[PDB]
Symmetry: C4
Subunit: 202 residues, 4 copies
């Protein structure tokens, strides 16, 4: 009941802050809808709880919680069980509401995303659209190239994503260099299909 | 009512600290006057509240709260809506009392400022004074040049400013290089009018 | 009684988190067994308590708490009392349950370990096993070489270890360069006995 | 009364921690004697309180609290009022008990000290002793040279010092390069009187 009580306290604090800034009741509604989807009436201090454990127990728990997600991801079917673990322990859960732009083309990228549930549209400057759904990943090209985002990515439904920051990305890939080659190969093919080629991926 | 209660608790804690250090009742008055203007009886944990949201919702809220400020700023009238967003999310509100020196000439600079409400005087070593008011910015030349502050800046009224740190400055400007050129052009003209030229701005 | 009360509060919070994630009662049992061995019904905020002290008092306390551990370690019998102090203040206590792999061969290493109580097995890719017990250390070769772990290390009993991170390691060894030579000599001999030679240790 | 209550709570927490580690009643006495001299029955959260203020108010308060200390220090009599301010805002108060070694010869140095109240002995390897008292500073040579401590420094009475870390030191001295020359000159003379010369001070 501490987890529920903490949800209630933090939400009330948001309500107060929204009241103070005189936000539209319709936008407050949007915030509430976000809290409901993202937290579902509960807040745990995950990092604090896992911080009390040792390494193996931390990795056991996360592997356990992320079983359905891992089953769904081609990246991981075939991959080393320990690469899968090194990624999982670095993931941040995030939720987006339909219509929200997750990534805008042309900006500097600082994270990658894995789709657990939802549909996203990858939109090029030139108006071509490709859909990505459960088990796919996007946002990695910028991280490989140290360049800019090559396309926009817009939630077409509620999306439940896990993000991975550029430092955690580069770290896991120092440890698993074969997996860098796997990401670059897909990146090259994805770029080709949108009229692009970057030779730093070769 | 948590926001008010937190103001009261933190103020009382300051009172205690001032009592302990036996500060003059007139200087305590000055502190109280500062708390009143800066907080207006409320303390929110903004960073904690916004930390619970996703990116788009964070940016929506800030864009919303900063509408009057943005309207007032020539820097932003004409500028990309997304450059404006990248700056806004990095701003720290600060208040100064009349007579306070915000910037002293000759020192190393670590932040820039945007005026929301108030009058400042830009004072040269040679005694020339230029006034800056709502919608203007100062403190940027040092950040561009990696040199020292080229003039002093003194609050002539209560000022309500937003500051931007040198790291956030350089970060936004990596992402929007055209805006670096816009800052340098104004910087060159401002320097010329005070007898200065620095070739690292060309 | 604050220390006990804090154990109870934090454990209850873990229970809640495990209930939420619907973890097997047998794995929850494993977690509880871990809490019991690691904390023994108490949680102190060590870093906060020691943070209030000065340097000498901090070092006195730690030297005192770690007397049995220091007696048991050949590394330290003969070593400078001040090298021993510089290491001790940087140690993190950790507990492992029988069967847990502390180190997997082939991965990047970020810490070293000192055994206070327990038996570990050092396992090579080629299936050779060497046991290490109270007073020994493992996990240092990777830190010296900036390479990868040269063997796996598996707890064969409950182990009570103290870890030392790669930054604290390199820091103490900048201050005591003779002790780097002592670690490298043992490292060279340990590698030789497992079919390995790395010339960056010479 | 929050400040007193916080002293009581934190002390009780130390008592508990000492009871747990079965520390000698005589060493517990030493800890209590330290708390009494260092805190005098009160704990303020200084950094949190000053964090709520603007720059000028922060600097006013510290200048005010440190008036007796500043009067006593030759380094500062004559120095720019703004160099004095830049140092003061970076100082950490610390207390040492008679007999404690503040600095051991031969180690890497990470801070400097200013004496507010007390007597210290500067002891060379060769057994020569020089006393330093209110208004003096020690611990700076290592910071200038990036070398090792050139002498030991032992509290001969209770000492009330303010420390300045190597980063804050180098930072203030980037901003006031004339003051680096002032420190180096005294450093050269101090070294000469103990049989030493380091050419990186020229
Ligand atoms: N042809 C494609 N098919 C699917 N996804 C793509 C394609 N091209 C780009 N993307 C994604 O759009 C993302 C936009 O950000 P990034 O460039 O970092 O990474 C990009 C890809 O992950
Ligand atoms: N001619 C000018 N007109 C208006 N403002 C100025 C002028 N010259 C300098 N300033 C401001 O004074 C500031 C002092 O700090 P900075 O050099 O960092 O940046 C400087 C400018 O932003
Ligand atoms: N021959 C050996 N005898 C005992 N321990 C060893 C031997 N070889 C390797 N180890 C330990 O196994 C550890 C695995 O990680 P590291 O390479 O970092 O350091 C290694 C050693 O500390
Ligand atoms: N001749 C001297 N007189 C007074 N103090 C000294 C003398 N020589 C060294 N010290 C102090 O002893 C300190 C030991 O640490 P540091 O070398 O960092 O700096 C040294 C000086 O500040």
């Amino acid at each position: 009941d501490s987890s529920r009580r903490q949800y209630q306290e933090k939400y009330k604090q948001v309500e107060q802050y929204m009241s103070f800034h005189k936000l539209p009741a319709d936008f407050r509604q949007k915030i509430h809808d976000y809290y409901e989807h993202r937290y579902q009436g509960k807040m745990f201090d995950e990092d604090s709880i896992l911080g009390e454990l040792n390494g193996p127990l931390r990795e056991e728990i996360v592997n356990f919680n992320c079983r359905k997600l891992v089953a769904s991801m081609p990246l991981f079917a075939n991959a080393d069980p320990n690469f899968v673990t090194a990624m999982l322990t670095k993931l941040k859960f995030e939720v987006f509401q339909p219509g929200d732009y997750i990534i805008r083309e042309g900006t500097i990228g600082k994270k990658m995303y894995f789709i657990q549930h939802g549909v996203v549209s990858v939109l090029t400057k030139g108006n071509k659209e490709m859909k990505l759904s459960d088990g796919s990943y996007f946002g990695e090209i910028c991280l490989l190239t140290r360049g800019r985002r090559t396309a926009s990515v817009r939630a077409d439904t509620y999306c439940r994503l896990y993000s991975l920051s550029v430092d955690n990305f580069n770290e896991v890939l120092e440890e698993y260099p074969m997996m860098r080659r796997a990401f670059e190969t897909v990146a090259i093919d994805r770029l080709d299909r949108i009229g692009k080629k970057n030779s730093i991926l070769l």
